């Protein structure tokens, strides 16, 4: 649309299990905050998934917390254009009659 600058931007919504989900709010089964919080992310190691499974107990409260992220895709617009001149006597008095 007119009157809105020159840029289109959208929103990307990363899923939970994704390496792009680099969030801060994350606490493991032992109730300790970790440097991550997108669970096991995208890795497919049996050991890693086993160690990061959201396993819960009977008397369990603040144990497994996940986090989400968001992304934006900018898109701009530019301008192009050329031209050319031509004299009058370069169109009338000339060999070809359809130079234009």
């Amino acid at each position: 649309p007119k009157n809105m600058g020159k840029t289109i931007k959208v929103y990307e919504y990363v899923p939970l299990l994704d390496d792009r989900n680099i969030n801060d709010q994350g606490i493991d089964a032992n109730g300790a905050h970790i440097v991550n919080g997108n669970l096991y992310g995208s890795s497919k190691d049996i050991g890693t998934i086993t160690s990061k499974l959201p396993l819960l107990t009977e008397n369990g409260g603040r144990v497994n917390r996940v986090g989400f992220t968001r992304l934006s895709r900018e898109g701009s617009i530019h301008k192009f254009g050329f031209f050319y001149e031509f004299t009058q006597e370069s169109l009338d008095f000339d060999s070809d009659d359809q130079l234009k």
């Binding site: 929103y11 990307e12 680099i22 709010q25 986090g67 992220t69 992304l71 934006s72």
Partner: protein, 51 residues
């Protein structure tokens, strides 16, 4: 805790990451603050003779 740290002041909202940020961060009042004509006290006291 997924807060909304002030995006205008620089602190990116907790949901946003990398290079996304918030986009609508202020409501524009679509009504300008315009001024009016300063009054005239001498132009009225003037007859016009054509040329």
């Amino acid at each position: 805790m997924l807060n909304y740290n002030a995006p205008i002041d620089g602190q990116k909202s907790s949901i946003d990451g990398a290079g996304s940020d918030q986009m609508n961060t202020f409501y524009w009042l679509k009504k300008a603050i315009i001024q009016a004509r300063k009054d005239q006290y001498f132009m009225p006291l003037a007859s016009v003779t054509n040329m």
